[PDB]
Design a protein around this ligand. Structure first.
Ligand SMILES: *[C@@H]1O[C@H](CO)[C@@H](O[C@@H]2O[C@H](CO)[C@@H](O[C@@H]3O[C@H](CO)[C@@H](O)[C@H](O[C@H]4O[C@H](CO)[C@@H](O)[C@H](O)[C@@H]4O)[C@@H]3O)[C@H](O)[C@H]2NC(C)=O)[C@H](O)[C@H]1NC(C)=O
Length: 117
């Protein structure tokens, strides 16, 4: 089907940088993949950042002001920077196989990110 795995807990650095991996297992023949980071507090859901990458590549597919994502095959590293204590929360990796059809979607269990000031 579509298992998305990410580490349950991570600690931001003193500079406000937190890194976690997100990995997927699937029967789909992934080529184009959309990875979305969702911050979740119960039913409160907010999109943090998102990027598209090509499975056969190996690159830095995401680099907005806040997230940096690198990808290799079915694994990605995600890094969120500029974190402060109030940004503490559950960050859920969502993965979509976007092309070719058929479409697949999976959601991870979430990485709880703790930030000390
Ligand atoms: C997510 O982040 C982690 C942590 O930074 C990152 O892990 C790093 O991956 C690189 C590349 O796979 C690792 O370096 C390789 O592994 C060993 C180190 O002992 C070497 O044998 C390898 O050398 C070969 O490959 C090189 C090309 O990359 C050649 O230049 C070389 O001549 C050899 O042929 C290579 O150096 C590195 O060890 C890890 N770092 C850690 C701390 O684990 C991971 O890749 C990131 N994942 C994604 C999807 O971005």
């Amino acid at each position: 089907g579509m298992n998305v795995t990410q580490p349950p807990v991570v600690l931001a650095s003193s500079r406000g940088v937190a890194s976690f991996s997100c990995e997927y297992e699937s029967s789909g023949k992934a080529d184009e993949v959309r990875v979305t980071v969702l911050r979740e507090a119960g039913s409160q859901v907010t999109e943090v950042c998102a990027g598209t990458y090509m499975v056969e590549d190996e690159l830095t597919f995401l680099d907005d002001s806040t997230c940096i994502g690198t990808s290799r095959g079915n694994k990605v590293n995600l890094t969120i920077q500029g974190l402060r204590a109030m940004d503490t929360g559950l960050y859920v990796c969502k993965v979509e196989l976007m092309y070719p059809p058929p479409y697949y979607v999976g959601i991870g269990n979430g990485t709880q990110i703790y930030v000390i000031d």
